[PDB]
Amino acid sequence: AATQEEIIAGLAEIIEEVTGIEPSEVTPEKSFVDDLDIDSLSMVEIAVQTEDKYGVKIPDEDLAGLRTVGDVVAYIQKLEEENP
Amino acid sequence: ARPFIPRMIRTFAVPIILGWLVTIAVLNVTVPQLETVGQIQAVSMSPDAAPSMISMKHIGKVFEEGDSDSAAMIVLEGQRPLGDAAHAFYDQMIGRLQADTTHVQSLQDFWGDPLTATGAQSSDGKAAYVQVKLAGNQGESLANESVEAVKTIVERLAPPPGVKVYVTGSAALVADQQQAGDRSLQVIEAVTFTVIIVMLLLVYRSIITSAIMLTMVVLGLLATRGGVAFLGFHRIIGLSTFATNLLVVLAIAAATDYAIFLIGRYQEARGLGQDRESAYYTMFGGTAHVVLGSGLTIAGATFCLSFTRLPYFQTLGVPLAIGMVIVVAAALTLGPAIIAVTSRFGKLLEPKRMARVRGWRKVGAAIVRWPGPILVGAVALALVGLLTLPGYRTNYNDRNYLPADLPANEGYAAAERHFSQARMNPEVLMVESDHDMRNSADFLVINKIAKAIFAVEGISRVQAITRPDGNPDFQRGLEQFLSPDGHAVRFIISHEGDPMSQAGIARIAKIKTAAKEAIKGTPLEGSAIYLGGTAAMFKDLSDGNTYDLMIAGISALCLIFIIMLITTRSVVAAAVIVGTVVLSLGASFGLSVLIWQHILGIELHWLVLAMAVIILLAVGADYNLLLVARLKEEIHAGINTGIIRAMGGSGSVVTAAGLVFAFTMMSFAVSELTVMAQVGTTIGMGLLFDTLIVRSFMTPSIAALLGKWFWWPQVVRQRPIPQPWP
């Protein structure tokens, strides 16, 4: 299926494309707004780009509480590996 | 392996530069300047098929008073009651004027006749007026030459102390309008160049780049003005002041916009680390068709405007299209060559700073997330401007749209200081029969007709044979009021109040109907009726204006839609591009009406909307076309990401171009022709609204809402074959 490393690499590529931060400086423990300096509109951009390229539907209702990268990858693997 | 056209343009840049320079020099040396050609080839302001023109020509022909419809008035004014020395000066001036025959066709003497002495005397006896008929129709070179000669003749003699002379009428006003237009053109050119300099220096933050922009703009303007002057030198087309001013300003602004587009694309392409050749090829392949389409759209809009009936728009049509074609060809052929030659020299055209890539991406994301409310708010903002429609009201007279220091305005003021305004613009009525009126029945018929004319409300005074003011001595009036063959009679009509407002225009039909009714029941039944004057001249224009506007406006939309369909190859995109601007017209119209009529207290002239709408549509379509062209390139990775990428990549360039163009068009306020200021300001606010709201918040929202149906009949996909994780 999908492993942690692949999702991390894809998300790092998306972050580098959007905000220009080097992909070597992203870890699951870091935070989007407190450390990575990512605004809500940047989160919307990330969600749209990751929906188009690979395909994941993340409604804003539960996206509001999504803060770190670890919970992001946990949600991604929960949605992907556990096929409805 | 590179495309043929850019390769051939790059290889032969120096011969292209040399040929363009040689052609510009030859055009500017061989033929005279544009102003002289425009002065030589002025056009008459009244169509030759108008009933008023034909009637006035008949008036002149039957009574042997020439054939032209022009007229001039000489006013004598003094601070003391007129004396014998004044009479001597008047008669010697009359003799000197009658000595000339090439320009002064005829004149009428009333102050020298004791029977009609009170006709020219004022209530307090401090002013007098004399009418002289010139040669040539109003607005053309012959009338201007005749009025200038009359002024020269009347000025060469020193007036007696205590009195002064003035010349009034429509011909003098038109000549002053021409001169004011020339001076305004000079001042406008200077101001526009200064504004372009300061704006380019502010935007690009580099003196050398701005110098290159000005080089291109100056070369383009010189080429187009020389070409138009050469074309007009050979009697091919007519001209007018409005055409020249619009041509110059629009050519400068379009050249600036094209240069901004090209160099912005070049800098953006190079900013990604590509070399110089790759950036050159990229900008050419990305902007050539867009530039060509925009130029053809503007040219087609002007040519569609050329399908009118009024002489002014008819003369406006062709030269504007020729100028736009020349400007587009010059830009497409000269820009890439200059850019390549300068860029080959190391460091001339390197980028300086990055403008904006984050804010526009955020705006695109916000648009994608919530398109509905954004579209609804934009539509509401567009409609609230149109909400103020029922307050529209137009004005006709040009007397108060000109500076008050002109000789014609001073003469009007001097006349109005003692006389009524309507006395300066009389009306002439002719009734033509088939026999002689030398029997009492015909004089009593004339008396009845005069009474019927005077019975009409709104007519201040009537002058006829039996009432010269409100036997050789009596025989003298026969030569002035009846034809030598004794087959027709004429009457003089003086209105009350302003003879130019809507009531004055409407009174013509009423007075004609009254005359026709008075003719009925008389032996003179079946007689011919003719009217001549300024109000009769303006009535035909008032009748035809709305039809001309509608016919000129209908075809422009169809031509623009066809051009956009050819360029983009999709029906829905072209329909949206047209519809957004059609909807946005109302906000600009309402804003202009609010600023001008209500706050400044000055109504709108009747020549404003016709020229404003076509230019507004033609310019406003180009921004949407460029945005759609960029989105078509960027859509290949997905619509949602394509919109964001296109907005990020082509956000600041369109903004800079729109502000530059609007601020260039807003420089007409310094002009002393207030019609020019009105047109320029209206275009300025309209395009500010277009570039701030319509371009950025309506078209992308509609595209995102519609989805893949935006590109019918072509087939596209929204999610492009999702891929596994890397």
Map out the domains of chain A as residue ranges: 2-84
Cα separation, B10 vs B526, in Å, equals 78
| Contact flag B361-A45 (C-beta cutoff 8 Å) | yes
Nearest-Cα residue of chain A relative to residue B639: A52
Q: Phi and psi dihedrals of B131, rounded to 5?
A: -105, 135
DSSP letter, residue B719: S
What b/e readout covers B331-347, taking b as 16+ CB neighbours within 10 angstroms?
bbebbbbbbbeebeeee
H or E element, residue B496:
none
Shortest distance, CA B612 to any CA of chain A (angstroms):
40
Q: DSSP secondary structure string, B342-356?
A: HHTSSSTT-------
Q: Which member of A2, A3, A45 has the closest CB to residue B365?
A: A45
Q: Which among B571, B702, B661, B577 is positioned nearest to B290, based on CA atoms?
A: B577
CB contact under 8 A, A6 and B726: yes
> Can B1-30+206-354 and B426-532 be said to share one CATH topology?
no
B638 touches chain A (CB under 8 A): yes
- Number of residue pairs across A and B with CB atoms under 8 Å? 48
What would the DSSP string read from start to end of B17-86? HHHHHHHHHHHHHHS--HHHHHHHTB--SS-TT-HHHHHHHHHHHHTTS-S----EEEEEEESS---HHH
Query: Shortest CA distance to B196 belongs to which of B181, B225, B216?
Result: B216
**Alpha carbon B685 to its chain's center:** 18
CA distance linking residue B533 with residue B451, whole number of Å: 21
In DSSP notation, B124-182 reads SS-EEEEEEE-SS-TTSHHHHHHHHHHHHHHHSSPPPTTEEEEEESHHHHHHHHHHHHH
Closest approach of A65 to chain B, Cα-based (Å): 18
| Resolution of this structure in Å | 3.0
Interface of A with B (CB under 8 A): 2-3, 6-7, 9-10, 13, 18, 39, 41-42, 44-45, 48-49, 51-55
Pair type for strands B528-532 and B163-168: unpaired
- Specify the CATH number of the domain B426-532: 3.30.70
Q: Give the domain B58-168 fold.
A: Alpha-Beta Plaits (3.30.70)
Contact call for B365 and A51, based on CB within 8 A:
no
Closest-CA residue of A relative to B635 is A52
Angle at which helices B639-649 and B608-634 cross, to 10°: 120
Nearest by CB to A45, which of B644, B723, B724?
Answer: B644
Cβ–Cβ below 8 Å for B640 and A55: no
How far apart are the C-alpha atoms of B231 and B326, rounded to whole Å? Answer: 12
Closest CA to B265 of B274, B586, B95: B274
The ranges assigned to domains in chain B are: 1-30+206-354, 58-168, 355-407+543-726, 426-532
Residue B248 tokens read as 């110059």
- In the numeric block, the tokens 């709108």 are attached to B604
Q: What is the CA radius of gyration of chain A?
A: 12
Name every chain B residue with its beta carbon within 8 A of the beta carbon of A18. Answer: 361
CA distance to partner chain A, nearest, from residue B29 (Å): 57
Q: How many residues does chain A have?
A: 84
3-state secondary structure B216-259: HHHHHHHHHHHHHHHHHHCCCCCECHHHHHHHHHHHHHHHHHHH
At B395, which helix (H) or strand (E)?
A: strand B394-395
According to the 3-state scheme, what is the secondary structure of B418-464?
Answer: CCCHHHHCCEEEEEECCCCCCCHHHHHHHHHHHHHHHHCCCEEEEEC
Nearest to B722 by CA among A57, A18, A83, A15: A57
Breakpoints of chain B, after residues (C–N > 2.5 Å): 470
**Closest by Cβ to B723, choosing from A13, A48, A53:** A53
Place of tokens 């056209």: B5
Is B641 close to A52, i.e. CB distance below 8 A? yes
Q: In whole angstroms, what separates CA B522 from the centre of its chain? A: 49
What is the DSSP secondary structure assignment for residue B106, as one 8-state letter?
A: E
Question: A48, B719: Cβ pair inside 8 Å?
Answer: no
Token readout for B599 is 């706050």
Q: B3: cis peptide before it, omega within 30°?
A: no
Q: Please name every residue paired with B463 in a beta bridge, in sequence order, or none if there are none.
A: B492
Each as own residue / partner, the long-range contacts of residues B716-723 (CB below 8 Å, 24 or more positions apart, any chain) are: B716/B635, B716/B639, B718/B638, B718/B639, B718/B640, B719/A52, B719/A55, B719/B638, B720/A52, B720/B636, B720/B637, B720/B638, B722/A53, B722/A54, B722/A55, B723/A53, B723/A54
Q: Are B144 and B175 in contact (CB under 8 A)?
A: yes
Cα–Cα distance, B178 to A32 (Å, whole number):
68
Min Cα separation A10/chain B (Å): 7
Pairing of strands B163-168, B127-133: unpaired
Q: Cα separations (Å) of B91 from B282, B467, B685?
A: 80, 25, 57
CA distances from B303 to B103, B244, B313, B337 (A): 37, 16, 10, 30
B714 CA to chain A: closest CA distance, Å? 21
- Spatial CA neighbour of B241 closest among B314, B184, B308: B184
E-assigned strand segments in B405-561: 427-432, 459-463, 488-495, 528-532
B555 — contact with chain A (CB < 8 Å)? Answer: no
Name the nearest CA neighbour of B182 among B370, B50, B33, B332.
B33
Q: What are the two backbone dihedrals, phi and then psi, of residue B515, each rounded to the nearest 5 degrees?
A: -65, -40
Closest chain A CA to residue B648: A18
Please state, in angstroms and as integers, the Cα–Cα distance from residue A17 to each residue in A25, A76, B147, following that order: 14, 20, 73
What is the C-alpha radius of gyration for chain B, rounded to an integer number of angstroms? 32
Partners of residue B368 in chain A, C-beta under 8 Å: 44, 48
In the sheet that holds B127-133, the strands lie side by side as B106-107, B127-133, B72-78, B163-168
Q: Which chain A positions have a beta carbon within 8 Å of B723's beta carbon?
A: 53-54
Residue whose token pair is 């407002």: B501
Name the structure determination technique. Answer: cryo-EM
Amino acid at B76: L
Chain B residue nearest residue A39, CA to CA: B362
Whether the CB-CB separation of B505 and B542 falls below 8 Å is answered with yes
The residue in chain A having the minimum alpha-carbon distance to the alpha carbon of residue B361 is: A45
How far, in Å, CA of A42 to CA of B696, rounded? 19
Catalytic residues of A: 39
Burial (Cβ within 10 Å: 0-12, 13-18, ≥19) of residue B260: buried
Of residues B368, B637, B719, nearest to A55 (C-beta): B719
| Side chain identity, residue A71 | D
Residues in B touching A13 (Cβ below 8 Å): 726
Q: Do A54 and B725 touch (CB under 8 A)?
A: yes
* Rounded Cα distance, B337 and A70, in Å: 55
Token readout for B572 is: 């829905």
Residue with token string 């003089």: B492
Class of domain B1-30+206-354: mainly alpha
CATH class name, domain B355-407+543-726:
mainly alpha
Give the closest-approach CA distance of B716 to chain A in angstroms: 14
- Closest-CA residue of chain B to A49: B641
B253, exposed or middle or buried, with CB in 10 Å at 0-12, 13-18, 19+? buried
